[PDB]
């Protein structure tokens, strides 16, 4: 456990995640005092939602730490899929929170009661400052690719929520109208879902063993080039998938002539797919009868 | 649409499924409505639990239909992963809800409200008997020895027991903190129930060696090394594509004059007797 912290601060992304999580926990302690000072009704719920925020940050940090683990007998490809899975789980969770902004939104829309004890628009401003630091640190967010994407999208969803609550507060105070708050909430939910969609599409495609999108357009030319090799009869059982970001695994079976140069055909096929961007390739050569 | 008129009559197991999802979702709606009408949150949490129990079956049916789709260029392995993903997704959407419920639940730990509807006792007992019916005379809804019984019966009857106990504790003794802790307990039960499905799904999606294949692989490697002309094995990767369908890849180094046809046939025999459906053996000839 003593050496666990040294790995966290070594890598840039893990250290950034850890520092942002520590800042979130410091804000949690500040609110914990501020709320055990007899303002529980809204403050404590805000704290528990932003503790959930810290939970998402912890999930991203854990995925970053685990992805660097050494491969073993049970985990032959390593633990790199935790990079993808985090990006999945962070994305879906955001969709979940979008519904929380939707349903609660109509709780303030058709229902006249506007009971509210926001702490004199003070915790919201500090939370938005925290969100600005978060979006500044993880600007490269929008194997540590889908982790950073999901973390950045979560921080941006937080920023949109802060914009919504601050805008509603300035609406009811100065303009005095009440209809803006449900509209801002539903618009924030729509923006959250729209931003989340691409990351979810990439994560689902990777987990569904789909052909890599940046490899799909070059695969037929690779197939023709392998087919052009002297003594290759046919190609079959071609399979290409994404392990983690930029890491592609491919497998194929070649039928060749009964007396073909299998050494040379193997070297040429591996060259053809190394130029295409495949890192891990398996070529099974079957000699034909005639 | 009109084709379902005759499907509902000729079914037996699909009849059991149809009746199960007909009463479970309807009573989930009833419990949600009564929970919102009251201020009890244990009822709402139980309704969410059974709603996701039914959505698990609906997603399983949809995922089976998608899994039967023909493969193509983008999806060369097919859509067979859509089962595991679907289950995974439902599990996540359960845990989040429990994760939310707990939160709101402990909210009412600080400031407990008290609203009664003079039917809370009626609807909790009816929810319990609905769960008993669906778990005993229907055999569906199994949420997953002692662990088996915990996953099968307890994980979906303890929520009803808890809401019944909250109904007793709210009206008879009169204390105000019954449902905030009942909601927390229901959330804990939800997470505990969902853990094993998440474990299996995550193992498959992490490209892990199949657990039913792991203990036979060393004997397979020893048998492949025992083939004449084989020098060494390399870069073996075995993973679960879908349930009981395993993909394996390995590289062999062999003698510069070795019988590659025979070694290939023997390696495929070895790993087929281990239960590997798809196998890719790359063979490299050594210099010396």
């Amino acid at each position, epitope marked *: 456990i003593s050496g666990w912290f040294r790995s966290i601060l070594s890598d840039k992304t893990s250290r950034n995640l850890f520092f942002f999580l520590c800042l979130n926990l410091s804000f949690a302690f500040v609110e914990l005092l501020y709320g055990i000072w007899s303002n529980c009704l809204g403050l404590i719920s805000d704290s528990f939602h932003m503790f959930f925020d810290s939970t998402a940050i912890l999930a991203g940090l854990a995925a970053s730490v685990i992805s660097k683990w050494r491969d073993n007998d049970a985990f032959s490809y390593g633990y790199v899929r935790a990079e993808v899975l985090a990006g999945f789980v962070n994305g879906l969770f955001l969709i979940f929170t979008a519904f929380f902004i939707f349903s609660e939104g109509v709780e303030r829309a058709l229902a006249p009661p506007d009971v509210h004890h926001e702490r004199l628009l003070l915790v919201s401003i500090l939370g938005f400052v925290v969100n600005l630091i978060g979006i500044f640190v993880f600007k490269h967010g929008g194997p540590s690719r889908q982790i950073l994407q999901g973390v950045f999208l979560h921080i941006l969803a937080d920023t949109l929520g802060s914009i919504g609550v601050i805008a509603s507060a300035i609406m009811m105070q100065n303009f005095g109208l009440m209809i803006a708050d449900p509209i801002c909430s539903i618009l924030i939910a729509i923006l959250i879902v729209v931003s989340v969609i691409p990351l979810l599409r990439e994560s689902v495609g990777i987990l569904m063993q789909r052909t890599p999108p940046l490899l799909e357009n070059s695969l037929p030319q690779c197939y023709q080039r392998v087919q052009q090799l002297q003594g290759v009869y046919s190609l079959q059982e071609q399979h290409f998938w994404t392990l983690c970001s930029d890491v592609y695994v491919g497998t194929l079976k070649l039928i060749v002539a009964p007396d073909a140069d299998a050494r*040379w055909i193997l070297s*040429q096929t591996h060259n053809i797919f190394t130029q295409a961007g495949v890192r891990q390739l398996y070529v099974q050569i079957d000699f034909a009868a005639m | 649409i009109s084709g379902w008129f005759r499907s509902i009559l000729s079914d037996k197991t699909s009849r059991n499924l149809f009746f199960f999802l007909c009463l479970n979702l309807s009573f989930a709606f009833v419990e949600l409505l009564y929970g919102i009408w009251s201020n009890c949150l244990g009822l709402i949490s139980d309704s969410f639990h059974m709603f996701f129990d039914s959505t698990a079956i609906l997603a399983g049916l949809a995922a089976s239909v998608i899994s039967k789709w023909r493969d193509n260029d983008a999806f060369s392995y097919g859509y067979v992963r859509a089962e595991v993903l679907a289950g995974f997704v439902n599990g996540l959407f359960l845990i989040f809800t429990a994760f939310f419920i707990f939160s709101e639940g402990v909210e009412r730990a600080l400031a407990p409200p008290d609203v009664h509807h003079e039917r809370l006792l009626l609807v909790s007992i009816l929810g319990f008997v609905v769960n008993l019916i669906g778990i005993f005379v229907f055999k569906h809804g199994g949420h997953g020895i002692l662990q088996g019984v915990f996953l099968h019966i307890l994980a979906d009857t303890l929520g009803s027991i808890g809401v019944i106990a909250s109904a007793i504790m709210m009206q008879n003794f009169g204390l105000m903190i019954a449902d905030p802790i009942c909601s927390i307990l229901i959330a804990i039960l939800i997470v505990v129930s969902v853990i094993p499905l998440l474990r299996e799904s995550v193992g498959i999606l992490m490209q892990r060696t199949p657990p039913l294949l792991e203990n036979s692989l060393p004997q397979c490697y020893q048998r492949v090394q025992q083939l004449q002309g084989v020098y060494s094995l390399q870069e073996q990767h075995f993973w679960t594509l879908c349930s009981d369908v395993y993909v394996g890849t390995l590289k062999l180094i062999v003698a510069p004059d070795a019988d590659a046809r025979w070694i290939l046939s023997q390696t495929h025999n070895i790993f087929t007797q281990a239960g590997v459906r798809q196998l890719y053996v790359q063979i490299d000839f050594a210099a010396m």
Partner: antibody
Amino acid sequence: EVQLQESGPGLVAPSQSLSITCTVSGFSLTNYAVHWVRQSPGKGLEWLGVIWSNGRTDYNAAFISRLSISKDNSKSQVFFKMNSLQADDTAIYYCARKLAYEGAMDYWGQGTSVTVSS
Amino acid sequence: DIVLTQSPASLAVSLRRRATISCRASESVDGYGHSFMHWYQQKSGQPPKLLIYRASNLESGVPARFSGSGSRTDFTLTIDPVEADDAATYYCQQSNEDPYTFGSGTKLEIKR
């Protein structure tokens, strides 16, 4: 006992076609590829093409538009057919049995000298 | 295509000595531990005879005095000891790339 013999016209008129028949013995065309290679004092040895045991043919890109290699397994002969014969094509032509599993030519015929002149 | 250059174009050696023939390729003719380069010997009025395949492997039935070496772009055929029967032209041929190409040839002069 493996051997290859080519029968072809020694003299070919320019702009006409050249046809050589290579008969092999000691091995089958069902599991062996056969290469066609020509040698001239001008440019040395030049690889023309190969035919495989299933009927697949691979040519040189310089002769793709005017070369055709065919074969018959039962009667065990390979037919070399070139079109548009010019003066630079005067050379000794060889049918060669490919070395198995290698990119070498392990056996050669005695080779026939083809002269393109009027 | 790949161009093979043989140096020297002619080399004169005496009996019971070592003859070295060097072939050089414009680009690497290697893949994954194998150099797909083959040495042939053509006597006068004879078809070429395969001596070395894959740049280091002695053909079945050729005398042990022939040896091959090299990798990537530079390859060497060595005859040691040189006999009187070795008076021929030695060629290098690559098979790494389509089309197959041969070397320029190198004549062996047996000094007596």
